[PDB]
Amino acid sequence: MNIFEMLRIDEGLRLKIYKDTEGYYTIGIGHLLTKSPSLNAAKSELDKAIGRNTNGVITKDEAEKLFNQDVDAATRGILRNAKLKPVYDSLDAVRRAALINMVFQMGETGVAGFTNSLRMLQQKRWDEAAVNLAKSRWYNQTPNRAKRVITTFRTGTWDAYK
Ligand SMILES: [Cl-]
Ligand SMILES: [Cl-]
Ligand SMILES: [Cl-]
């Protein structure tokens, strides 16, 4: 397993514009297009992202390409964030993947706000961090996915994805 396969499992793959769990226009492997309620604003962002007139539909290669960009960008954003970088650097490879997963879903800002959990993760208090992570909108809104990520931070293994 690796970050790519992990995200592929959590986000799925859809080739036509769809709405995410929050109601936002997305495509591919969890590539958010816009928070705007307009399908037209979404198709336009799509064409700009792809470099062609898509008419709201992309190929598998294009979805994969967006995904590669988004993972890279997620990871690099973590290294550039003063609150996240130190946590990431302290983690082992498996847990690093868990933190990238949360940043991919919720944005760097969102994650950077889990101050207490980040502190427990850096201290390697796994069970305590698992408990704290769960007291969040994140966990209540997407319980299945959050548990998978939480178990990942707790155990340092990919068991939840097997
Ligand atoms: Cl893009
Ligand atoms: Cl460095
Ligand atoms: Cl879920």
UniProtKB/Swiss-Prot annotation:
pH-linked activity: Optimum pH is 7.3.
EC id: 3.2.1.17
Presence of the UniProt keyword Hydrolase in the record: yes
Binding site for substrate: L32, F104, S117, N132
Effect noted on mutating T26E: Complete loss of activity at neutral pH; covalently bound substrate
GO biological process: cell wall macromolecule catabolic process; defense response to bacterium; peptidoglycan catabolic process; viral release from host cell by cytolysis
Phenotype upon changing G30F: Almost complete loss of enzymatic activity. The enzyme is destabilized by 1.5 kcal/mol
GO molecular function: lysozyme activity
GO cellular component, one term: host cell cytoplasm
Catalytic reactions on record: Hydrolysis of (1->4)-beta-linkages between N-acetylmuramic acid and N-acetyl-D-glucosamine residues in a peptidoglycan and between N-acetyl-D-glucosamine residues in chitodextrins
SUPFAM superfamilies (UniProt xref): Lysozyme-like
UniProt-annotated catalytic positions: E11, D20
Major location (coarse): host cell
KW Phosphoprotein (keyword) present: no
Induction or repression: Expressed late in the viral replication.
Alphabetical keyword list: Antimicrobial, Bacteriolytic enzyme, Cytolysis, Glycosidase, Host cell lysis by virus, Host cytoplasm, Hydrolase, Viral release from host cell
A Pfam short name: Phage_lysozyme
Superkingdom to which the source organism belongs: Viruses
Places the protein is found: Host cytoplasm
First-tier enzyme category under EC: hydrolase
PANTHER family: T4-TYPE LYSOZYME 1-RELATED
Entry-linked HAMAP family: ENDOLYSIN_T4
Summary of the function given for this chain in its UniProt record: Endolysin with lysozyme activity that degrades host peptidoglycans and participates with the holin and spanin proteins in the sequential events which lead to the programmed host cell lysis releasing the mature viral particles. Once the holin has permeabilized the host cell membrane, the endolysin can reach the periplasm and break down the peptidoglycan layer.
Protein family according to the UniProt entry: Belongs to the glycosyl hydrolase 24 family.
Name of the molecule in the record: Endolysin
Gene behind the chain: E
